[PDB]
Amino acid sequence: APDFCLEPPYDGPCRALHLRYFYNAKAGLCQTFYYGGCLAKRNNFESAEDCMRTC
Amino acid sequence: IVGGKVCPKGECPWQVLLLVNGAQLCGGTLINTIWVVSAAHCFDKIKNWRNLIAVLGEHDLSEHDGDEQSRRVAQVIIPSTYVPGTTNHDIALLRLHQPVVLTDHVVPLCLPERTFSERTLAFVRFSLVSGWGQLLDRGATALELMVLNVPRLMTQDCLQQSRKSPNITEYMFCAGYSDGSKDSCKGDSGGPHATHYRGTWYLTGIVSWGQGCATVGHFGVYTRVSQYIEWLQKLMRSEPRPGVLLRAPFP
Amino acid sequence: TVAAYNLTWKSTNFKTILEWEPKPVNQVYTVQISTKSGDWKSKCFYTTDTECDLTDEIVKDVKQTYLARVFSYPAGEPLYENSPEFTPYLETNLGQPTIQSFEQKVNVTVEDERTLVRRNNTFLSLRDVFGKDLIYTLYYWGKKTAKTNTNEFLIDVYCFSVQAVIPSRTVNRKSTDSPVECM
Amino acid sequence: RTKLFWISYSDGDQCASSPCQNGGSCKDQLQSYICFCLPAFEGRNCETHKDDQLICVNENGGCEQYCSDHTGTKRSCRCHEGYSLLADGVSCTPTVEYPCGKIPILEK
Ligand SMILES: *[C@@H]1O[C@H](CO)[C@@H](O)[C@H](O)[C@H]1O
Ligand SMILES: *[C@@H]1O[C@@H](C)[C@@H](O)[C@@H](O)[C@@H]1O
Ligand SMILES: [Ca+2]
Ligand SMILES: [Ca+2]
Numbered sequence: 001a002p003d004f005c006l007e008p009p010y011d012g013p014c015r016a017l018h019l020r021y022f023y024n025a026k027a028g029l030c031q032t033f034y035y036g037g038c039l040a041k042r043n044n045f046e047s048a049e050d051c052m053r054t055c
Numbered sequence: 056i057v058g059g060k061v062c063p064k065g066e067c068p069w070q071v072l073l074l075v076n077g078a079q080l081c082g083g084t085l086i087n088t089i090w091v092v093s094a095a096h097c098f099d100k101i102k103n104w105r106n107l108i109a110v111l112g113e114h115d116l117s118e119h120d121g122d123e124q125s126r127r128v129a130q131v132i133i134p135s136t137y138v139p140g141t142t143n144h145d146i147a148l149l150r151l152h153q154p155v156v157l158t159d160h161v162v163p164l165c166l167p168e169r170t171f172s173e174r175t176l177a178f179v180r181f182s183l184v185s186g187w188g189q190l191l192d193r194g195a196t197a198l199e200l201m202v203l204n205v206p207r208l209m210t211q212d213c214l215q216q217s218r219k220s221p222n223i224t225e226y227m228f229c230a231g232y233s234d235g236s237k238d239s240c241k242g243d244s245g246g247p248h249a250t251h252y253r254g255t256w257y258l259t260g261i262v263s264w265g266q267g268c269a270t271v272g273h274f275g276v277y278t279r280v281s282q283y284i285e286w287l288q289k290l291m292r293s294e295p296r297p298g299v300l301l302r303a304p305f306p
Numbered sequence: 307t308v309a310a311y312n313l314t315w316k317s318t319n320f321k322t323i324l325e326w327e328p329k330p331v332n333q334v335y336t337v338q339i340s341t342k343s344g345d346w347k348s349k350c351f352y353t354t355d356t357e358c359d360l361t362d363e364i365v366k367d368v369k370q371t372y373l374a375r376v377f378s379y380p381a382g383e384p385l386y387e388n389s390p391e392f393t394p395y396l397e398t399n400l401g402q403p404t405i406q407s408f409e410q411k412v413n414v415t416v417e418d419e420r421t422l423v424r425r426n427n428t429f430l431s432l433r434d435v436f437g438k439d440l441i442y443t444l445y446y447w448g449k450k451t452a453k454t455n456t457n458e459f460l461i462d463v464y465c466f467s468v469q470a471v472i473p474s475r476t477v478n479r480k481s482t483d484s485p486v487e488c489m
Numbered sequence: 490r491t492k493l494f495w496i497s498y499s500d501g502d503q504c505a506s507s508p509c510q511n512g513g514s515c516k517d518q519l520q521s522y523i524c525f526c527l528p529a530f531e532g533r534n535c536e537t538h539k540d541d542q543l544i545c546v547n548e549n550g551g552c553e554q555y556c557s558d559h560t561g562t563k564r565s566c567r568c569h570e571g572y573s574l575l576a577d578g579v580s581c582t583p584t585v586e587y588p589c590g591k592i593p594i595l596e597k
Contacts, residue, residue: 013142013221013264013276014096015188015244016081017196034241037096038140038264039221046100065594086589157587159597165569165589168555175549178338178346206343209383225382249590253553255569255581256590319516321523323533336546348546359532362539402497402518419516420525429525467494482519483497 004042005055012039021045023055030055056186057269058237059203064114065122067185067202069164069256072110073097073128073245079116079196082186082246083109084258085163088154090291091128092166093147093245094261094278095137104128104299109151112160116187116198122160126151130298132290134283134305142221144305145263145278147245148290164249166288167257172281175252176259180206182230182250184262184275188242192268196242203237205230205248208274218272221264226282228260229274238275240268248277307333310356310376313389319401319432320422322364324374324389325357332381339363339374352379365423368394368435400432400470400481403442406457408466408487414459416442416468416484433457436472443469445483464489510535553580 001023009022014036022043024031030051035044045051062070071083071091081097091109101107105127112122130150137144155161167176185202189195208216213229223229230248231238239246239262248260260277267273286305310326317323324337334352339360350358364372371393377384406415420429432440444452444459445467452459459466465488470481497519504515509524513535516523526535543550543564550556552566559565568574568581571588575581583591 011241013266014094014099015239015241015262015264015268016094016097016099017079017242018099019078035099036241036264037094037099037244038142040140063594066592068592068594069590159593162587162591162593163589167569170545171549171555174546174556178348180340180343180345209386211383211386212388253549255554256592318518318521318523321525347548351542351544351547357533359537362531401516401523422523422525427528483494486498 001055002042007041007043009033010035010039010041010044012036014038021048021051023051025055056184056188056197056201056203056238056243057191057240059185059201061197061199062185062202065160067183067200068112068160068162069247069249070113070185070200071245072113072187074108074110075101076103076106079187079242080107081242081244082188082262083149084245084247084249084261085111085155085161086166086258086287087163087291088157089151091149091151092247092258092261092280092287093149094263095133095145095147096140096142096263097245098131098133098147098300099140101131104131107131109149111155112158114200122158124155124158124161126153126155128152130295130301132301132303134286135302136305137302142227142264142276143224144226146261146280146283148287150295164247165255165257166284167259167281169281169284172257172259172284176250176257177207177228177281179250179252182207182248182259184230184239184243184246184248184260184277186239186243186246186262188244188246188262189240189268192240192270194240203239205232205237205275213274216272217274220266220273223276226279227263227276228279229276230260231275232269233272233274235269235271238265238269238273240265248280307378307380307385309378309385310335310387313374313376313387315390315392315397316357317364317392317394317398319419320361320365320368320394320398320435322361322392322394322398322422323357323359324376326376326387327356329356330354330381334379334381336377336379337374338377338386339372341367341370341372346375349374354381361422364392364394368398368423370394396475397477399478400472402482403468403470403484405466405468405484405487408464408489410463412459412461412463412466412489414444414461414466414468416457416459418457432470439472439474441471441473443471445469508534511538551579 016037018035083091243262246262512527545556555567557565
């Protein structure tokens with residue numbers, strides 16, 4: 001996996017509840033958070049599968 | 056909502072609940088029988104639009120009292136000007152597949168005329184922001200609709216009062232508290248900012264963003280709806296067109 | 307449009323005018339005033355003046371703290387500047403007093419002058435408004451003095467002078483000296 | 490102090506010029522005056538007719554809902570859809586059971 005993968009989840013300033021996936025390095029596994037909906041960082045996916053694919 | 060109260064059942068009857076497959080997404084504002092106004096970023100990477108439902112007359116999420124009306128959003132309209140995953144021009148106009156029935160528990164908020172909005176409403180100090188959003192920044196979302204009253208700021212004062220975040224444009228306005236005590240939060244996007252005037256309530260803002268929720272030295276940022284009344288009215292009179300997701304020219 | 311500067315409150319016995327600069331060139335002004343939590347109220351609509359009378363607004367509640375702002379316009383939010391905060395009760399200046407009469411010890415009487423504050427369409431006096439916050443100082447002629455929480459001095463026998471004072475004040479504590487009187 | 494006294498001592502009556510307009514009463518001050526105005530006037534000099542600013546930016550022109558300014562003429566008042574303007578020409582009254590921005594509960 002790429003570097004971004006070490007980056008903490010980024011919910012951003014938007015106040016929507018987008019359930020997204022991120023990779024927990026600590027855990028060395030993908031997990032979920034609520035993205036606000038704008039200014040998403042690279043460690044943030046639509047699903048486990050492509051997150052897992054990616055990190 | 057951070058530091059509000061439960062909005063007494065039926066006292067925020069224009070308040071809408073947007074869900075995607077039964078899960079809470081954002082709020083909305085009924086401005087008539089088949090149109091709801093929300094936030095442009097609520098629609099980020101939504102893939103199954105057949106599951107996107109608007110609920111009217113809703114109050115307590117833990118139970119179904121029977122006053123709730125649910126409708127599939129037939130169409131999501133945003134300005135051609137909104138760039139995906141950003142804050143500028145945060146607004147959407149949702150067309151309900153079938154109209155809701157007006158009841159004691161389901162009433163639209165008045166969309167005002169732009170000069171009314173700008174000459175008078177923007178100078179009314181407090182307005183109510185509501186939702187089923189987070190009770191605290193990293194807290195849990197409410198089961199019962201919350202309502203909060205916040206004071207508005209002209210952008211220069213907001214800037215000055217802010218600890219030195221995206222840019223606050225002409226399409227936005229700040230409202231709230233800089234003491235980390237009251238604001239809107241995650242789960243309230245799309246929700247109304249409603250101003251009381253001479254006995255009538257009017258839509259003035261849309262829940263949008265903030266640098267956290269009720270963060271010291273920060274205010275909640277709302278979409279400045281007055282900027283869009285005309286775009287919104289042309290669309291409600293426009294003959295209905297096909298796409299599910301439409302990015303209409305703005306102005 | 308240029309932005310108004312040097313916003314200053316001019317207030318005497320509650321008569322209150324906000325003054326600014328600069329003199330306008332192809333630009334107009336409008337004033338907005340409010341209390342911490344109330345609505346903004348527009349005054350002196352698109353004025354070429356560099357002053358705005360706000361008495362009518364501030365007498366509504368002399369105890370409240372006001373803020374007004376001056377908006378500038380060519381002759382999207384306006385270009386504006388905020389004024390110092392103003393609490394009428396605490397800062398209005400005390401107007402020049404007046405000896406009403408005096409009589410022979412001597413008994414001196416100071417007039418209870420009216421202010422810009424109205425209660426059911428009638429002007430209130432200094433006493434109506436400050437109650438016991440108001441005290442007076444007599445000066446007689448080497449010179450002497452006397453203070454009361456009333457409008458009378460009972461001295462020992464002449465020229466006298468009076469000055470109104472709100473000792474409880476931090477700003478604008480004393481009025482000017484009234485025109486002197488002599489027997 | 491004595492300087493304040495002396496300044497005071499040697500000042501004249503700024504009211505000599507009869508500045509208070511329209512029924513107003515001038516009261517002399519130290520190198521200034523105050524104008525006590527009649528209820529329908531305001532201003533430093535009582536020059537302002539509280540009566541002459543029926544425009545839309547002035548308390549919504551006294552309209553309940555919408556206000557339209559008009560050159561060479563009086564301002565117009567109007568209402569939202571589901572509402573009708575009254576004979577008074579400033580007020581709006583609902584034309585539907587469920588007019589926008591009315592809370593049935595609070596109303597009933
Ligand atoms: C009468 O006198 C005062 C004293 O300065 C002056 O300021 C006014 O303009 C005038 O009418
Ligand atoms: C002074 O004050 C104003 C209010 C009017 O009453 C005048 O007639 C009076 O002399
Ligand atoms: Ca329910
Ligand atoms: Ca004088």
